[PDB]
Amino acid sequence: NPWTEYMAKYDIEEVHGSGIRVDLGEDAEVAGTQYRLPSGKCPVFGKGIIIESNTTFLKPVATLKDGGFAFPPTNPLISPMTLNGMRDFYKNNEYVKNLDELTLCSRHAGNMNNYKYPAVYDYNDKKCHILYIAAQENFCFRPAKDKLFENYTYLSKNVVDNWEEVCPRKNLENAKFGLWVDGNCEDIPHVNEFSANDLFECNKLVFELSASDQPRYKSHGKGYNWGNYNRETQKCEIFNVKPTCLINNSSYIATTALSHPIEVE
């Protein structure tokens, strides 16, 4: 199989290793009590938390419906923090100061106190928001990809510093996910067809069906994490087994729950 190295980043069980829609893949103790928390190794592009009721989840947590999920204002301001603020903050730490923006944001969040907070990096403002609340679905709320969340990036304490190399980001244009069989890339045999107006809607549906750690209930990255979008027939072909090759097909764009809902390569 000549695709093995190239397709490794799409083996989501291995490279991410946790829930995507809801990531609660590890446990940590804070003062004699066991809590679940995000533990996936890849960033989740376009993911945010919808609350319905009229205020962003990146608003600071209340000090409940008054506020959001994020760290409350501190002194000096640890959250939110700009990329350049973080680089200045850590400018004496050669192991941290040159990290990519997402890994930096993850490490920054994890530098607060066993149990390490997840984060969201917003590419719009170039700000890292440490999330005080690690819950992702229930205040009633749910995780989602939305046009408003497009530049948000949901980050666990475990985001690897080489995610650029080993994690999905972009959708693959003119390409269809497949299964390497006997020296040839074959179609995924069974797919679950969801109609979708565009790639974004397909990416949002794959995310909705993807690996989830909320209904000892961990997904470990298993689930409907992939979709082939036929842009001609407007079908989001969703499946739950890892792809092991690509088929060239101008009609398709290959997406994953982790991938950005818009960017193509």
DSSP string, 234-251: TEEEEESS---EEEEEEE
What is residue 103's three-state secondary structure? helix
Instruction: For tokens 């000549």, name the residue.
Output: 2
Rounded CA-CA distance 167/71 in Å is: 27
DSSP for residue 6: G
For residue 50, give both structure tokens. 């919808």
Q: How many CB atoms lie within 10 A of CB 6?
A: 11
Cβ(214)–Cβ(179) under 8 Å? no
User: What are the beta bridge partners of residue 239?
Assistant: 226
Q: Name the architecture of domain 2-10+170-210+224-265.
A: 3-Layer(bba) Sandwich (3.50)
Q: Which helix (H) or strand (E) holds 201?
A: helix 199-209
Main-chain phi, psi angles of 155, to 5 degrees = -125, 125
Q: Which helix (H) or strand (E) holds 119?
A: strand 119-122
For residue 49, give both structure tokens. 């938390």
Instruction: For tokens 């080489």, name the residue.
Output: 162
Rounded CA-CA distance 61/152 in Å is: 18
- Solved using: X-ray
The CA-based dihedral angle spanning residues 171, 172, 174, 180, taken in that order and rounded to the nearest 10 degrees = -130
Rounded CA-CA distance 85/244 in Å is: 41
Main-chain phi, psi angles of 12, to 5 degrees = -75, -30
Q: Where are the domains of the chain?
A: 2-10+170-210+224-265, 11-169
Main-chain phi, psi angles of 109, to 5 degrees = -60, -40
Q: Which helix (H) or strand (E) holds 128?
A: strand 127-130
Cβ(41)–Cβ(26) under 8 Å? no
Cβ(204)–Cβ(171) under 8 Å? no
Reference 206, options 222, 194, 215, 218; nearest CA is 194
User: What are the beta bridge partners of residue 223?
Assistant: none
